[PDB]
Each structure stands twice: as C-alpha cells, then as structure tokens.
C-alpha cells in the first residue's frame, strides 16, 4: 500500500481522456446487459449503451479509475470527480 499517493499530492490531469471514457462506457454497458441494477430513471430506452451514457450524464457511475505511473505507483480518481468535456 506504499504505492498509493495521498489525495492531496495528486499531480495528474483532472480531466478524463477519451480512452477512459470509452473503457467506462464499455464496462457499464456490459454490466447493464448482464442484468445489473440501474441507478437512473430509465425512460423508454432498451439499449445498454444509451443507459450507460444517461448514467454518465448525471454522474452516477460508481467506478474508480486507477492510473499507473511509470515507476509503479498509482493514483485513484473517482468517476464522479472527473471532468468530462461535451
């Protein structure tokens, strides 16, 4: 647990890349398509990808991204606190 960086000493970008966005959407779409509970008010949609986008819009995806520094340490960022461009 020595690798983990304290929250105050986080020196990575506070925006989320396109790769992280695509990975998160894919994971959430798979979990929804495997009958996982939905955290938002579904309105007439039957596609897991669109419901994943909808959950992302209200920032309700309960996932955490771990970013690997080259030496081996890592930095943990919640999906709620990552700024997503539109």
């Amino acid at each position: 647990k020595e690798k983990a960086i304290p929250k105050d000493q986080r020196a990575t970008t506070p925006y989320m890349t396109k790769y992280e966005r695509a990975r998160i959407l894919g994971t959430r779409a798979l979990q929804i398509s495997m009958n996982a509970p939905v955290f938002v008010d579904l309105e007439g949609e039957t596609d897991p990808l669109r419901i994943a986008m909808k959950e992302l819009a209200e920032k309700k995806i309960p996932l955490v991204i771990r970013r690997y520094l080259p030496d081996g340490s890592f930095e943990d960022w919640s999906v709620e606190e990552l700024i997503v461009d539109l």
């Binding site: 994971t27 398509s33 994943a52």
Partner: protein
Amino acid sequence: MVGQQYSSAPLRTVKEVQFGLFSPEEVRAISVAKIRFPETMDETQTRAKIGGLNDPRLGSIDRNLKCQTCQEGMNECPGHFGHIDLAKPVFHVGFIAKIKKVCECVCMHCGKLLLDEHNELMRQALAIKDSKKRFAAIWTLCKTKMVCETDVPSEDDPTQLVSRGGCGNTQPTIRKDGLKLVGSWKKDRATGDADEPELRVLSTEEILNIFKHISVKDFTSLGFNEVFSRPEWMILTCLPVPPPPVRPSISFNESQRGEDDLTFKLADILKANISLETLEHNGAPHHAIEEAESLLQFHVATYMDNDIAGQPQALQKSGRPVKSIRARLKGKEGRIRGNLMGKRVDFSARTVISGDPNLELDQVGVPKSIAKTLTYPEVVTPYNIDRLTQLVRNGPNEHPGAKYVIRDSGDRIDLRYSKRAGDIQLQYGWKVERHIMDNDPVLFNRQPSLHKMSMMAHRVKVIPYSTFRLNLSVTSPYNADFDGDEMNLHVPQSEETRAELSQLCAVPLQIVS
C-alpha cells in the same frame, strides 16, 4: 471459456519468460518414453509400435482414441516428450562458433582462464556489466596467449613472481573444417624441433571434459549462468523427441498415412545411432567408428538447420530439401511473422464497394446474405425478451432471425435442426446469436493500411444486392475508387468492443488528420 471442460487450477497471466538450456538430467526426467525403434507402426499395420516413433504414451492426434498418459481427447492433449540416447556426444549446430571462441579463451589442459585479477586489462574487462561486449573484449585479448604462465609479477612489485598454479603447457590454434574442429600445436622453437604445427581433429568428449571442469567465477566471467546456461550443456548427449502434435500425420485413407519430414529425419537419426552402437560393441576398426560418428553428426546437425554454410543439403527421396526446424520459423510465412503477428480470423467478410449519395457520412450498406451469415451474441434481459423471442421464432432462414441459442451452462442449440424455433422458452442470461441489425457498429478497412485513417468504424444498413455502400466523401481517406476495389468488414462480438468501435474509431472523429 476455452477448453469445454472444468479445471480447479487458478487462472493466471504470464509475466516473465526466462530462457535457458536443458541439462541431460532434465531431458531424462521430463520424458515418458525412451524411443528405441526406427519404426512407427506395428507389423499388423493397425496400431503404432510401442517404443517406436509413434508410441501411444506421447499422445494421439486422431479424434477417436485418447492419450494413454492423460486419457484426454485430441482437443485437450498438449503432447508429451520422448528422448533418444546418443552413443557419443555430438556438437550442436547452433553453438559451434561460441564453442570454438570459448575454447580458444581457456587452457586446454588445466581447464582455467589464461588470465587472472593481477592484470589491469582483466580489471577493465571485469568492470563491464554488458555480457556481450565483455566476452568480445576478453576473446580479442586472450586469443593471443598460446602459453599458460606459471608465475606472474606482483602488482606491488614487478620483481616478485607469484605462482598462479598454471600448468605451463602450450595451447594450439583451432580452425573449423565443415563440422570438425581441428587443432594445430606450434611447438616451441627452443625444443629443437621444426616449426611444424602438428594437426589433429579434436575429440568432442575431450572438449566436454574440459568444459565440465570450469568453475563458478569463470562461469560468471565468461558470460554464462550456473542454473540455466552452463556451457557443458552446449554439447548434445540426449535428443528430445517432440510429440506427434508437432509433426502431424496426414491420413488420406485408413491405411494411407503420409508422415511429416521431421519424423523421417528422426528415424534416420535413430537408424544411424543404432548402426554406430552395433559397430561400437563389435570391435570394429577405428576408421569405421570415425566415419559413423561423422555420419551421426551430419544427421543431427542437418535435423535442426538445413542451410549450413559450406556443406551439402540433406535431400528427400524425391529430391526436395528436408524442411528443418529453422526453416519453419525463419520465413515470412513462418510462425513468428505468419501465425503470431497476423493470422486469419472469424466473423469477417470481403467484397467490392460502390457509391451511394443517399447514405449518411458514417453509414455502410451491407448485403442481405452477408448479414444472414454473420451474427452477434445478444444477452436475454427484461428489456429485449419479447423481440428476442420473436427473432428465435423467425428462425435462421429469415432476416431478422437467429442461428444459435447458448444456455447458461455453455451448451449451444442449433436452431435449424432443433424443431424448437416455436418451442424454446428463453430465460435470463441465455444468449441468442442473432443476425446483424441496423445501427450495429462494424470495422471497415482497405489494404494496404498505411496510416491511421485507413481503418474506420461504421453503422450498418441492410440492403439488397452484393456490393458494399459508402458515402462519396470517405473515399479519400481510403484511397479507394469504384472500378473493382474490395474492402474488408470485421464484426465486434461484445459490449466493450462495440463501445470502443463507437467512441474511438468512428468516421465523424477522423476528419482533422
């Protein structure tokens, strides 16, 4: 979900690949069948001879009988290794140069390095961590000391001589003739004899004995390893025999088995070995023994590499060269560049293109039959069970429809033979392999794929006729026109893959190059 079986061993991922070399002890311990006969299959011509090249303990490739060692079908048996014992040690065709180089750098009698810590140049060489340069420098330095020094001047005082235990004998000069390593002794001029270097072919067993006498500090200094890479192992004593998976037999009919080249070469190796053995114990003259050893060395050398410089090529009974192991891996069509970096795939199509001005920028017209052949494994959930049920009822001869139904347990029901298009009731977690439907992402490309923008994602639209359809503005990134060009279509088979094709490689996102 690979193997169609269950095992309790945990799944893990490869992290390191530590290379090395077999010791003969390892070849013996690993092997399960000491091959003994130059024949494969019995005199009844119905079963393989036990102890032959096709011993059942190694395994079988056929789909009816199972392996004797593990009792598994041909789709689960990896294959097990045999071994063959050699009468006399044989040089390995891939380390002749290294053997000679390390032979010239070590005394032929006392089995020790010609130098030690006293010399400054040895300190410089031992200061280098790079093994390759270290060995090259040590070779180019110590190739010129033909006599071992018994006493060396002390570093503190050049007038003081300290004995290093050297034997003081005279080392030869070694040259290579074909597969033979011939030495020449240049006797000292003070001996009174002429400066005629006596020539002799060095015996492999003597060289093996010399190498076996080297120590650990010299192990590290030369650039070898104690556990994995000892030099004594560079000379062959026992030859491992690969299982029949590596050399599969192609059977046209019940009694028509065309065997691989590798097994023919191995049979010849064993034949020569038994001939040399039966001449060895019969008290034959030395000339015949030398000739037989040369023949054995030739066969073992050309079994692995068949392109050796300055020798004839081992030919087949029809005149073609024998495809050795090296020729399997070295080519462009060999394993590395033909079966591990690029390979043929499933769920793909290839067809000519055309132009459609009514299609949107990022939409591709897919013919009907190509849409009826490729599929997608959709998961049954509360949101789709009605449409999926109607799709299953439709069958495989109608678009839209389905072609297979996978249960929770991994079993897969072919909808065509099972009358149960109108019978199967679907549950939560089953999978329907349905046709590709409008607005499914696909990957689409043209060869050669020179740059990033030549492989892009698209949304499907099912159309009649046999051509693909494209918008007339994407023909510039593809460098493609419509006078006969064919392009390739690849279908993703998951949700993560579909999201990657829709959020990374889409045509809208590839406009500013």
